[model samples]
Target: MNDVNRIRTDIINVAKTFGAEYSEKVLDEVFQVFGEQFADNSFMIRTSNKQPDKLGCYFRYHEEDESQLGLAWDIARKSGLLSDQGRPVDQLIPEICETFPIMADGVDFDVKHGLAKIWQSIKGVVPVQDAFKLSLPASVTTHSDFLKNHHLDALYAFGIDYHHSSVNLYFDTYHPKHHTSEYYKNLLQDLQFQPPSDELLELLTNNGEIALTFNFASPRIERLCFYLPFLNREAVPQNLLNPLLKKYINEAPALVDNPGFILGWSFGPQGGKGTYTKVDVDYHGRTVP
Candidate 1:
């Protein structure tokens, strides 16, 4: 099967194993809208130790394509994220789409347009996206003061966690050529979220980018993911990957056996601080190696 079919089949099997409450209807909707784009490697699956039995699909909106932005909005609208009714964030989607380009063009900005993630609910029979995320890039002010006044100057992205009824802030330890180790450490302390180990921090900064995100309802971090590509994964020390793999092997056994599909691992807030959690597997098919 091709990458598109392969990803669809794999996720369907996963949903079956975990007893996905919804039928094939929801999956059909997603594939119908972005089946062609999947060839470009714009999607990935995420599983967390916090919910090892559950699965989530993360779809990216290409930064170079303006049309993808509109499609992302469509998904959000259909998913109940852009409701015509309630919630402060439910009404912020359109404004984000309109000013995304200007904000993305800022000197320090690195916006990726959007990354809409949907979870498979075990209770709901309908397959609509229950959660969504939009990349905020850098600390630029928009028409929304609610976001501006929240001290989000140092964040990489900000989005709402509809499932949790809270806000999520995504932080990149190094990016735009300005952040330092000290900067991340201070930022963690400033945000009241737990910090990763010094050894792990050093590895993340030197080899690959460290991505930290947490919900606003409670200020505790469950995992920290490193976005190291397939080639870059080799540069990381075995001591880091091996021990963690042993820890998370039971949770994500398939990822441990297949290294190529592995993008990077989400570590920490398990076993101990900075311990292994889940392996972030990729299924780009032929679009990427």
Candidate 2:
């Protein structure tokens, strides 16, 4: 940022307090004391912005092995930035979005935008040397009768594990009451949620880590239905996404968003007004979806 606005941004961001009145007062009166105390002691500092910044601002170190927070009259301790000109300035908070880099399916995004996690979820865990393939059969094609009705449904892991319509919750609503293995066991057992394998045990624990499975909905072949929740996109780490991306050289040619279709063609005498018995469309390729 320009030197003109550097201090203003820092004051608003660091303390994140009530307003300018509060930010200035604390940094000026209280935090200003840190310069007097730590003027003799210093550490390495680093600046992230690839542009011009001062205060060694943006937490910039002199690389001369640079750096510099909090306040109180009770103990007389204060934390804030002290400029070379001998003045206390509001400390700066880390520039979060650029500071943390997130990637999904080889795409990069910032966390502050909240899109990084979703893209990751959509691009779940890819198959490894031992992963079980869940790709559906291409023969699982649509029938013409469905076209007569203008409706069709084809899904993989998303089939009816059970039905709906209830006055209260059917499955027990639960989160980790405490962080522990045995506790996770009790909760999972209580919910009757069976995890896939022994190595995946941690997935059952809500230990401040992503506890959700993010495997790609389907693999090769045709289609598969998976009940992938979009909300907890971040909760799923290394979740597999489209196998086509990994396997195909050319973008597999088919429909873009819509799956394949099943339609009938008939000829009268010599390719006369052929009647289309049905046009069933349900299988869409995920090339672009």
Candidate 3:
């Protein structure tokens, strides 16, 4: 089997342990949406689903500029990548693998970062300065009440083991010098959390809110997404989750049952690599389950 199919099948096989028959929409993200976005860096996909609707697909993008998701989704749909309903899984896999070019620029600036060097090395158009990233070089903590959600259970079913140690999140948020990143960190501190924060108690008390197992020993699923019991259809600023992710509640005595967003990352390269430094979008949009 080819690398693409092999990886896709590996994830599906993992899901079977819990009898999860993920919908085509979910598969599109796993095989194509995500794969193509981070095509530059080699990544591994792992998934787990107890209920069909609960099909949990996770990644360690070896990336999200929220805008890119909308663009990627449209491309996935326009190219027949989303029409997974009637098609056999066999047929979908090829379409899934072949449709990656739906990426207009051969390289999606939306998800690609820090390539000023790589791009220059290849004699391509240089967008910005090469290698320009900043961050705190200390051991930081990332706090998210992921264990409470059924999404965690779905992940557990997929084969990822939770270590007793606190998970360290590395992303655009961790680098405080980045202006916005600095602001969120201070906000979380004001709200009473650690250096890296997420609105844990804020949503629950105020309103309501919210892993690659293959490595098993020390696997980090780039990000984990779970939904709350509430329907946040065009509700708040960034939808069901807090728009400012850096501001976390430090404590969730009980599940901070409101709504919010989250993220924990150190930083990419100088110019960096990944999606943070890029994006664009419109009317509709979406993350994980």
Candidate 4:
């Protein structure tokens, strides 16, 4: 309900620099559809080696008519852009709705609350989780747990693509205390992730927390993300990732001053060979002056 226009304008301005005017328009329209329901300070841009960068926005859920699910179903029916990834949209909608029903503050609530609990705790500003998002890269359906599995507990947000034929799931885990690379390595192993090179593992796990994501277009691929705080900013411009990335693509933009807030490394299939990296840049409060 707050700062939607400011975030919208800022994304449009940044999209121009990426030569993604069409994507910008698509996201802007999605924003209009979301209107005041959009989550504030949750706008992010995902940059990758395989696909054009895409914009992402989160929308909060309302209890009265379950607006989160209602609007998403409305968009899918009308836009004809999102196709079923694992399950048909009709079936998928009902499954998510039933599993994570809206929670009333004073009604039958517990510490074990699902998505709605995460939504309420954040109060729409910090954005740990929003019921839905637009413009996320799609996740391939490896299998359908449909939020019924415990693994889905970390699934903070899921979205149907507004501009592509895909669905995406975003999972994040934060630890009060940072752990060793081995700790995170073990976690990924549970997901069937191939062991990372010692160098890569150190780089990724040394960060404070981890985030994992899946999209429709990338089969058997999951993204493992690490945070690079301001303290680590100086080394990023000359990071080893430059040479590694250059081997695959022609070039990447020079990293300078606050390059990114998060570093995402895609892992999966073919021994994790053809995977790419993504960096999430948050605009913070920057808006058109």
Candidate 5:
């Protein structure tokens, strides 16, 4: 068999042996066995390749935010103020007044402060600078302007945009709700001239499945990375690398079948080289083909 086919076979065998659950176990086990060596080798590899500095942003709603919303619903339900059948009327109030007393009095929850904490946690694992949260109001004009003006190093939108809809009903809200396909289509339509190359399209298609794996695997990798000697000793531990590697592995299947994805991987020149080295195991645990 050819080299690619040989690697593919190896991938299938390894994945079958480990599978998803086993992969989770092995991530921790491998870190215990090879963490130091891997960290040392990774540094050496990073140095040799003249790689650009790595900066990443992970956007997520605060736990407190959700907890407050839930509390609002609970209050409305228990007080017999709002029906449990339709959208909660309490959702109409801003989170500050409904959730926390301090914010209710008009304190700037310093969302920037929250973003800074997250950035610091991430930077402790990866080399980064000036990593701060870029908060924007819930205005499309503001969003478009920010995208145009800042040339954001990275942009992430997470969860639902329930706050932006005119309808107060839980199900009958916003552009992204029932319009997943249209959301993407409009996104593409807007960027018609700047159409993502074929490779990017494939990556987007496979992203959902990859997210499922990462959600399941990250905690395992996070614990493993934290325990590694070099990483533990370093000023900035390399725990971030574990997730990065896991993300690459998750996306490997699409990369193998789609040349465009492969080309996009090659564009980075350094960290991307590992794209070809790792095996693409089908860990979905069922016969897909």
Candidate 6:
């Protein structure tokens, strides 16, 4: 058979064996099988934009063998073409479920909940990864401890309350001083948010670091426009550009002006001398010289 016919035959068989309700029921069962892991590791269930609407759950695969195996089995049962009640599948479930107790206690569900709420609030316009681009890298980095401490301190100091949202820390690998400004301008222009002031530019350039406090109720971020600069001679990768662009187009609704908050950063050669101007004027527009 041709490729399309083969796929159609497969779909027909699947529909005959497992009706739509059965498919959805199996998905919920799959969730129950994997819910603890999801709660523990901040795994997210995502649906694709294409027809047939693929659904899948994703979680960070840490070094725990049992949890990993459980996650694998859960995925298999949810989307695998085989019957859900066969001996082979049934035998695997208990074995996989046993691993959950041994797996390290998962990530804080409360934090994951907040992230889910935020993601859901914006996912229609922005891609799933864009809403989390900035926060995800920090969660797994060596700076995690510092983030935890400082975010808690800020929470207490500012009288803000939240479960997992952390203070925004400004970091620059190449142009520490100018990176924040460049990133801010690009983000604001991309998001159509208001531009920064001259004083704000000076503060980011002069201060070694800036921190912005946010909470669930008043979810305002000072450094709302953080991004990395591409220094390689080759063209900037589409993967890097797409998320920022998606975020600009999708996730920025609550941004507003406030004093003492750093929104973004800029980057270029030290002392402002370089062969290339890192700013792409045609795409970003000539808002800043």
- RMSD to native for every prediction? 10.4, 25.8, 20.1, 10.7, 19.9, 19.4
Which candidate ranks first by TM-score, i.e. highest?
1
On the 0 to 100 scale, the lDDT of residue 285 in model 5 is 15
Cα error of candidate 6 at position 42, Å: 3.8
What is model 4's C-alpha RMSD? 10.7
Ranking by TM-score: 1, 4, 3, 5, 6, 2
User: Model 3, range 1-289, lDDT digits (tens) per residue?
Assistant: 2545544454455345323344545554445544545433323232222122333333333123433423533454465443434322213223322422212211111111101000001122111111111121112111123221111211111111122112211121112222333443443344232333254323322221112111212222232221222222233223322221111111111112432222222222223221120001110112211
For candidate 1, which ten residues in a row score worst on lDDT? 104-113
**Residue 238, candidate 6: alpha-carbon lDDT:** 31
Per-model TM values vs. the true structure: 0.54, 0.16, 0.25, 0.49, 0.21, 0.20
lDDT of 2 at 207: 33
Candidate 5: pairs in clash: 199-260, 199-261
**Model 1 CA deviation exceeding 4 Å by range:** 1-3, 14-25, 51-63, 75-85, 102-156, 169-192, 207-278, 285-289
The TM-score of predicted model 4 comes to 0.49
lDDT of the candidates, in the order given: 0.39, 0.21, 0.26, 0.39, 0.23, 0.28
Residues 16-112, model 6: lDDT tens digits: 3322122434334434444444333322211111122221111121223343533443343354422344322133224323322333222111111
lDDT for each residue of candidate 4 in 1-289, tens digit (9 for 90 to 100):
4567764554454444443323544555556544344343232333344432432222223322333424444553465423344533324444444445432211000111111111211121223233343233334333334322323334444433322333445444444223467655665575566556677667655564344455545654454445544322344434535443322122222123343334556554436542455544433412101
Residue-pair clashes per prediction, in order, are 0, 22, 34, 6, 2, 15
**Which residue pairs in candidate 4 collide?**
138-215, 138-216, 139-215, 139-216, 140-215, 140-216
Among all windows of 10 consecutive residues in model 4, the one with the lowest summed lDDT is 105-114
Model 3: how far residue 33 lies from native, Å:
9.0
Candidate 5 lDDT over 237-287, as tens digits, reads 223334433343334332234211111121112222211111112222111
